[PDB]
C-alpha cells in the first residue's frame, strides 16, 4: 500500500521509461532507413531522367516525346506504390515507342534485303555482260 | 499517500500513452520502408525500357544509313550495266560490218 504499491508503481515507471526509450530508438532508426531508401530512388530517377533528356523524351514538348509527359515526380511519403501508379502515364507510352521502333526496324530490314537481292542480280548481269563484250571482242579481232 | 500514488498512476498512463504514439509513427515508417522495394524495381524497369529504346533507335539509324548506301550502289551498277550493254550491241553490229 504505502510502500508495496508505491514501490511496485515505481518499478513500472522504470520499466515503461526504458520501454519508451527503446521505441524512440526504433522510430529514429526506421526514419533514417526510409531516408536512405528514398535517396536511393531519387538517385535512380535522376539517371532515368538524364537519359530521357538525352533521347529528348523530356522536357514537355521534346521532339521525341510525341506529346507525352515522361517526367516522374517522387514526393516524400506517398501511398503504397507511389511509382507503380505511373505505369499508365509513363510505362504504356514508353512500350509504345519501343514497339513502333521494332516494327519500323522490321520494315527497314525488309527494304534492305530487297535492295541486297537487287544488287546480287545486277552483279550477275554485269558479270555476264562483261563476258560477252570480251567474247565478241575476240571474235571481231579474229576476222 | 493518494497524492503521490495518483501522480505515479498518471505517470504510468502518460508513459503508456507516449509509447503508443511512438509505436504508431514507427509503424507508418515501417510500412513506407516496406513499399520502397517496389519503387526501386519500377525505376529499374523504366531505365531498361529507355535503354532498349536508345539501342533500337541506333539500330534503325544504321540500317537506314546502309540502305541508302545500297541505293547508291544500285544506281552506279545500273550505269555500268547500261554502258556494257551498249558496248555489247556495238560489237554485234561490228561483227556484221566486217
Residue numbers in the entry:
A (entry chain A): 1 to 143
B (entry chain B): 1 to 98
Give the text the authors published on this PDB structure.
The bridge between centromere-associated kinetochore assemblies and spindle microtubules is the Ndc80 complex (Ndc80c), a heterotetramer, conserved from yeast to mammals, with globular elements at both ends of an approximately 600 Å long, largely α-helical coiled-coil shaft. Closely paired calponin homology (CH) domains of Ndc80 and Nuf2 at one end, augmented by a flexible, N-terminal extension of Ndc80, form a microtubule-attachment module. The coiled-coil shaft of Ndc80 : Nuf2 has two specializations—a kink or hinge at about 160 Å from the globular end and a so-called ‘loop’ at about 240 Å. At least three interactions involve subunits of the DASH/Dam1 complex (Dam1c, consisting of Ask1, Dad1, Dad2, Dad3, Dad4, Dam1, Duo1, Hsk3, Spc19 and Spc34), which coordinates end-on attachment of multiple Ndc80c rods around the splayed plus end of a kinetochore microtubule.
To express the loop region of human or yeast Ndc80c, as a recombinant heterodimer, we cloned codon-optimized synthetic genes (IDT) coding for Ndc80 (residues 370–509 for human Ndc80) with a TEV protease-cleavable 6-His tag and Nuf2 (residues 252–347 for human Ndc80) into the respective multiple cloning sites of pETDuet-1. To facilitate formation of the Ndc80-Nuf2 heterodimer, we introduced four cysteine residues, two on the respective N and C termini of Ndc80, and another two on those of Nuf2. We obtained crystals of the human complex in space group C2 (a = 49.9 Å, b = 72.3 Å, c = 80.1 Å, β = 98.56°). From merged datasets that extended to a minimum Bragg spacing of 2.0 Å, we determined the structure by molecular replacement with a four-part model based on the AF2 prediction (see Materials and Methods for details and for controls to eliminate model bias, electronic supplementary material, table S1 for data and refinement statistics, and electronic supplementary material, figure S1 for representative density maps). The final model agrees well with the predicted structure, consistent with the strength and robustness of the molecular replacement calculations. The Nuf2 chain is a continuous helix opposite the entire switchback. The short, disordered segment in the human Ndc80 structure corresponds (in the predictions) to the segment of Saccharomyces cerevisiae Ndc80 containing the substitutions in a seven-alanine mutant shown to fail in the transition to end-on attachment in budding yeast. The two structures reported here are both examples of using AF2 predictions to generate hypotheses for constructs likely to yield informative structures. For example, to design the particular loop construct that yielded the structure shown in figure 2d, ambiguities of coiled-coil heptad matching would have required a series of alternative pairings of the two chains on both sides of the loop itself, and the pairing C-terminal to the Ndc80 switchback is in fact half a heptad shifted from the best guess we had made previously, extrapolating from the structure of the four-way junction.
